[PDB]
Design a protein around this ligand. Structure first.
Ligand SMILES: NCc1cccc(-c2cccc(C(=O)Nc3ccccc3CC(=O)O)c2)c1
Length: 230
């Protein structure tokens, strides 16, 4: 997260760190006791390593009593998650066991009604992604409040010409933005999961290149279809 602030410890208990052999790869969001929603492109770096999900974390490295590591039993990328195509970048991860919920580990309800979030709505994006353009990694969870941008402006020639479909949403990226290591994390509007971070053009903090987020409401039937196969 660029231009954000350290989150209050365990105030975003739905946050998941998606890890490969214990290294933070992407964010994730707990959506059920045994399911984590993230971004399909995250498993490009995976190949043949233990994909795990860290729950109850504020810090990635500091010993916290609420920290729990789960193995992934199943990785369900969206069928059309063709690499480098910004569309359909959703991934469902089934945990090895049902997570015990508490003040530091709690799922986030997601929007099911297929309705666009009103532009200008303030939404919270959180992650352990880089905090500057050089690639400095924070140890503690960071967050930022970003207003939602209307789809047309985000689609626009200056922004991302022709590529922003009905299944995507955008948020302002002027100085404050999601960045490398934040994909798969949540865009939360009024406590409701509305989007999942994606990398888009991969430029961070540029006003002309808005942050792109997979519109979770567009995938309601797909999410429901996977969450029943458990
Ligand atoms: N709002 C702009 C924005 C938002 C989120 C991420 C980026 C961004 C920038 C530069 C490089 C990358 C990258 O290599 N990603 C990657 C590739 C493969 C596997 C995992 C990942 C981590 C990830 O995507 O977070 C991403 C940019």
């Amino acid at each position: 997260i660029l231009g954000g602030r350290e989150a209050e410890a365990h105030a975003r208990p739905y946050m998941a760190s998606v890890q490969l052999n214990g290294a933070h790869l992407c964010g994730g969001v707990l959506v059920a006791e045994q399911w984590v929603l993230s971004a399909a492109h995250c498993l490009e770096d995976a190949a043949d390593g233990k994909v795990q999900v860290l729950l109850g974390a504020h810090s990635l490295s500091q010993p916290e009593p609420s920290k729990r590591l789960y193995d992934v039993l199943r990785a369900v990328p969206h069928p059309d998650s063709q690499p480098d195509t910004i569309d359909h970048d959703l991934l469902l991860l089934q945990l090895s066991e049902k997570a015990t919920l508490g003040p530091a580990v709690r799922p986030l309800p997601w929007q099911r009604v297929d309705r666009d979030v009103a532009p200008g709505t303030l939404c919270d994006v959180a992650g352990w992604g880089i905090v500057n353009h050089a690639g400095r990694r924070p140890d503690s969870l960071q967050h930022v409040l970003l207003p939602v941008l209307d789809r047309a402006t985000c689609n626009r020639r200056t922004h991302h010409d022709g590529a922003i479909t009905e299944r995507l949403m955008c948020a302002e990226s002027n100085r404050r933005d999601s960045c490398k290591g934040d994909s798969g994390g949540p865009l939360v509007c009024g406590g409701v999961l509305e989007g999942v971070v994606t990398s888009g053009s991969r430029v961070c903090g540029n006003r002309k290149k808005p942050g792109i987020y997979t519109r979770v409401a567009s995938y309601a039937a797909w999410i429901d279809s996977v969450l029943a196969s458990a």
